[PDB]
Amino acid sequence: GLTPQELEAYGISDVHDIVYNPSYDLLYQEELDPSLTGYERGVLTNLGAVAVDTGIFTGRSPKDKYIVRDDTTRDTFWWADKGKGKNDNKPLSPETWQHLKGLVTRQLSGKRLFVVDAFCGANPDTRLSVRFITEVAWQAHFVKNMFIRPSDEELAGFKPDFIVMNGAKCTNPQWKEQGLNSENFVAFNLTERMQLIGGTWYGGEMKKGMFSMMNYLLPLKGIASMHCSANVGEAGDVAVFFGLTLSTDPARRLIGDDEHGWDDDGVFNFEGGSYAKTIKLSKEAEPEIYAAIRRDALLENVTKRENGTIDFDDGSKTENTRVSYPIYHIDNIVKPVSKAGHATKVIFLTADAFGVLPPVSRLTADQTQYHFLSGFTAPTPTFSACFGAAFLSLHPTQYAEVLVKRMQAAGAQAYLVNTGWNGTGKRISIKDTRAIIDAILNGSLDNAETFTLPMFNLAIPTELPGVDTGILDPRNTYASPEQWQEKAETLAKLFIDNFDKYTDTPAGAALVAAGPAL
Ligand SMILES: [Ca+2]
C-alpha cells in the first residue's frame, strides 16, 4: 500500500484518503456513486459496462503536447523546431514545467486520490514501472484496463520508473504569457520522468503518453518500439502487422492489438488491455470487441438512452467513441503473459487507392525501412511515419533502424500487401488477400521465385497458391504497361515528396535510393 507521506514527495499535500490499486469491484461502486458531478459521472449501460463522457476533448490534443528541453532531451529528442521539424514534440522550458506540475499537484492536494501502479511492457526485464495518480475513479479504471496489472507480490517491491499525474480538472490560466497553445496541457519531463495532464479528460492521453515515452526510452536501448498488432501461430511463429482484422485468425493467438516492443526475448505487448473504436460497432463485424463490452469495460463518449441502451451508431458528439477493457475480455489471446518469441514475418498493409501496388511484394531490408518510414495508405493518400507519427519521440529513421536490426537477427521477412484497389478501380478481393496472408505466414513466399516491378523495384512472386496468377502483377489490370507506369509515376512522386522531409539525416538521405524512382 501507500502512505500520504509517500505522495508528499511529489508535491501533493493534505491527502484525504488513498485508494491504492483498486479492484474492479471497488471501481464499479465508485463510478456509480450518485454524489459524483460533471465529467466524473458514470452511467450503467444495459450491457453491464459503465459509460463516461469526456467533455470537449474527445480525442488527443497534439497542439497541447510539450516535452521539457533540458540536458536529458536536448540532443536526443526529435524536436518540433529542429531540422525539418513536422511533429508535435514542442519544447517546454524547465520553469514552465514547474508551474504546470504545481498546477497539477495543487489540484490533487486536499483530495481523495486513486493511485494505480502498473507496468508498461509485458516482458519483466524490459518493462517500465508506472505510477498513475488521479482524483477520478474512472480515470484509475482506464489505466487499470490499459496497462499491465501487477500481482500483489509485484506490488510489494514496486518502484516507479515514471509518474503520470492526471489533473484534468485543472487548467493553466497563465498559458498565453507562457507561449503555450491553450490553457490545457499534456506535458512530459524525462529528467523527472513524469507526465502531466491538465484540462483534457480524454483517456487516450494517458495511453498515448506512455506510448510516446516508450518510443523514447526503448530504441535508445536497442529495443524496437512499434505501432502494430502482433499474433502467434500454433507452432510459435510470430507475425507483426502494420497499417489498417487480418490480425484475427482463430488459429493465431493475439499478443496485442496496438503497441509492441521487440527486445532480445521477442515481441511483447506494451499494454494490458485494448482501447477500441466503437463508432458503428456491429456484433457481426467485430464479435470479439462487442463481446468484451461487459462489466469492467469502460465506454467513453458513447450515446446511452434513458433505459441504458447504447446507440453505437450515434457519432453526433464524436466519431471517436471508444471502449477500454482488460485484454482477457478477448478469449483468443496469448496468456498468461502477452509476449512471445521473435517475429519472423512483418506485414505492411496499405490500401492503395491508386491501384498501383501489387497485392503482395517481398521487400528488401532497405525497402522495409523506406516503406516503414512512409506509412502510406489511400480513398485519398495519407502518409504517417512508422505508421504512427504522432507518438514518435525520436527521429523516424531511428525506429526503422532498430526494427530492421531485430528482423535481421530473426531472419524475418517483410511483405507489402495492397488491400486496396487495382487498375480496374475495383477492390482487391478479400479472398485473395486472405490467401496472400496465408501464403506469407506459412513461409511459402520467403524463397519463392519473383519478378521485379519497375519504378518501385518490388519483388513479386511469380505464383501464389490459391490465387489466380493474373492478379499478382498490378500492370495486368491496366490497358498497357505505360498506363500503369503513368499512375505509378504519380504515386511515386507522392512517395518521394513525402520522404524528402527525412533526408536531412544521413540515414534518410541514404534510403532515397530504396524508394520509387520517377
Ligand atoms: Ca494506436
Domain layout of the chain by residue ranges: 1-37+63-222, 38-58+273-330, 223-272+333-516
348 and 243 in contact (C-beta within 8 Å)?
yes
Point out which residues pair with 326 in neighbouring strands.
273
Strand partners, 333: 254
How far is ligand 1, taken at its centre, from the CA of residue 59, in Å? 12
User: 111 is written with which cell numbers?
Assistant: 483530495
Report d(CA 47, CA 32) in Å as an integer: 15
Cα of 259 vs centre of ligand 1, distance in Å, is: 7
Measured distance CA(302)–CA(319) in Å, rounded: 9
In 182-232, where does DSSP find H-type helix?
204-220
- All three cell numbers of 106, joined, read 495543487
Please compute, for residue 109, the number of CA atoms within 13 A of its CA located in the half-sphere on the CB side. 14
Query: Which experimental technique did the depositors report for determining this structure?
Result: X-ray
- Strand duo 322-326 + 185-189: pairing: unpaired
Please provide the CATH number assigned to the domain covering 1-37+63-222: 3.40.449.10
Task: Output the furthest CA–CA distance in the chain (Å, rounded).
Answer: 76
Residue 120 to residue 147: CA distance in whole angstroms: 6
Q: How far is the CA of 83 from the centre of ligand 1 (A)?
A: 26
C-alpha distance across the termini of the chain, in Å:
63
Give yes or no for a contact between 242 and 224, defined as CB atoms under 8 angstroms apart.
Answer: no
Centre of ligand 1 from the C-alpha of residue 453, in Å:
32
* CA Rg value for the chain: 24
Ligand 1 centroid to Cα of residue 518, in Å, is 33
E strand or H helix at 413? strand 413-418
Grid coordinates representing 196? 502531466
Q: Do 38-58+273-330 and 223-272+333-516 agree at the fold level?
A: no
- Bridge partner list, 188: 67, 195
> Residue 157 carries which DSSP code?
T
Given a contact cutoff of 8 angstroms between Cβ atoms, the answer to whether 139 and 169 are in contact is no
Residue 390 Cα, ligand 1 centroid: separation in angstroms?
Answer: 10
CA 69, CA 89: separation in Å to the nearest integer?
Answer: 10
What separation in Å is there between the alpha carbon of 26 and the centre of ligand 1? Answer: 28
Q: Characterize the bridge pairing of strands 90-92 and 112-120.
A: unpaired
Output 149-152 pairs: Cβ under 8 A, ≥24 positions apart: 149/21, 149/118, 149/272, 149/326, 150/21, 150/117, 150/118, 150/119
Distance (Å) from CA 347 to ligand 1 centroid: 17
How long a stretch of residues is the chain? 518
Contacts of 189 (CB under 8 A, 6+ apart): 67, 68, 70, 97, 101
425 alpha carbon to ligand 1 midpoint, in Å?
29
C-alpha span between 290 and 39 (Å, rounded): 25
**Residue 252 phi, psi (nearest 5):** -125, 125
Q: How far is the CA of 354 from the centre of ligand 1 (A)?
A: 25
DSSP collapsed to 3 states, 464-512: CCCCCHHHCCHHHHCCCHHHHHHHHHHHHHHHHHHHHHHCCCHHHHHHH
Dist CA 205 CA 66 (whole Å): 12
CB half-sphere exposure, 42, CA atoms < 13 A? 26
Which of these, 301, 306, 298, 312, lies nearest to 55 by C-alpha position? 301
Write down the H helix ranges in 90-203: 94-107, 137-146, 152-156
Break-preceding residues in the chain (C–N over 2.5 Å)? 244, 378
Cell numbers that stand for 457 in this block: 523495384
State CA 251 to chain mean position distance. Answer: 24
Beta bridge partners of 261: 225, 268
257 alpha carbon – ligand 1 mean position (Å): 8
Going by the DSSP 8-state scheme, the letter that residue 475 receives in this structure is: G
CA distance 518 to 514: 12
Determine the distance separating the centroid of ligand 1 and the alpha carbon of 128, expressed in angstroms: 19
Fold of 223-272+333-516: Phosphoenolpyruvate Carboxykinase; domain 3 (3.90.228)
Identify the architecture of domain 38-58+273-330 in CATH: Beta Complex (2.170)
Residues near ligand 1 ion, CB 5 Å cutoff: 258
Specify the pairing of strand 322-326 against strand 273-277: antiparallel
Closest alpha carbon to 110 in 7, 186, 2: 7
Instruction: Determine the 3-state secondary structure of 311 from DSSP.
Output: strand
The three cell numbers of residue 492 are: 511515386
- What's the CA-to-centroid distance between 193 and ligand 1, angstroms? 22
DSSP at 328: G
Comparing C-alpha atoms, which of 372, 381, 370, 366 is closest to residue 347? 372
Nearest to 386 by CA among 372, 404, 401, 367: 372
